[PDB]
Design a protein around this ligand. Structure first.
Ligand SMILES: O=C(O)[C@@H]1[C@H](C(=O)O)NCCN1C(=O)c1ccc2c(ccc3ccccc32)c1
Lengths: 51, 101, 48
């Protein structure tokens, strides 16, 4: 056996057989934390056009 | 970037804008990070998703017992506890935080 | 009555003891769904 951080692959599947995956692996994206805006149209917001 | 840790520093210094790698090894580094300044967008948007697993000998006849037992932990809530272990961090990828600047 | 199931079918351990599965073609969880609540402040009157 080869328990570890082994990613299931098509090429590896035809030379060795794997088990049911216990951890999901994909292709993700990082980014720095966003500070956050303040809805630049905020001044007309705390009311309604009817009011 | 030839080093995973070095790429983060370049990303944290504004040199880069996005580091792309495996979810199971990049989510852990996003969770375990001081300041919680790194957030991923791999919330179900992971592309070409293949899980981990236990390799065998292609005829080892251990596949069925291993799969049955491994699915038992996944069927139960066993693997989740091990995820709250090492594969976790103090930082939360979820926002759970409001800032007024 | 059939030889091969092609449909969203979650992998478990009970059913795995009578069949053989394949590698999943999609990964998903179980998230509670609730009706979205439209925000509206009560504020009965300015007298409140
Ligand atoms: O999928 C990959 O690219 C390979 C391998 C495979 O099946 O080839 N599958 C698993 C991923 N991986 C790697 O080389 C790799 C790359 C980087 C880290 C780790 C493991 C732990 C870390 C901890 C901190 C920073 C980086 C790492 C493994």
């Amino acid at each position: 056996m080869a328990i570890g951080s082994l990613t299931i692959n098509e090429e590896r599947s035809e030379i060795v057989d794997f088990s049911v995956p216990f951890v999901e692996t994909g292709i993700s994206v990082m980014v720095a934390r966003s500070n956050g805006t303040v809805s630049p149209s905020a001044f007309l917001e705390p009311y309604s056009p009817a009011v | 970037q030839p080093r995973v840790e070095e790429a983060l520093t370049q990303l944290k210094a504004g040199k880069l804008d996005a580091f792309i790698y495996d979810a199971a090894v990049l989510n852990y580094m996003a969770r375990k990070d001081e300041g919680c300044k790194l957030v991923t967008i791999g919330s179900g948007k992971v592309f070409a998703t293949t899980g981990y697993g236990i390799a065998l000998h292609k005829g080892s006849r251990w596949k069925r017992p291993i799969d049955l037992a491994l699915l038992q932990f996944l069927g139960d809530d066993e693997i989740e506890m091990l995820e709250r272990l090492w594969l976790s961090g103090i930082c939360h990828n979820d926002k759970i935080e409001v800032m007024s600047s | 009555q059939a030889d091969m199931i092609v449909a969203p079918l979650t992998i478990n351990n009970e059913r795995a003891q009578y069949i053989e599965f394949s590698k999943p073609f999609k990964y998903q969880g179980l998230t509670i769904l609730v009706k979205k609540e439209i925000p509206r402040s009560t504020l009965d009157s300015f007298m409140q």
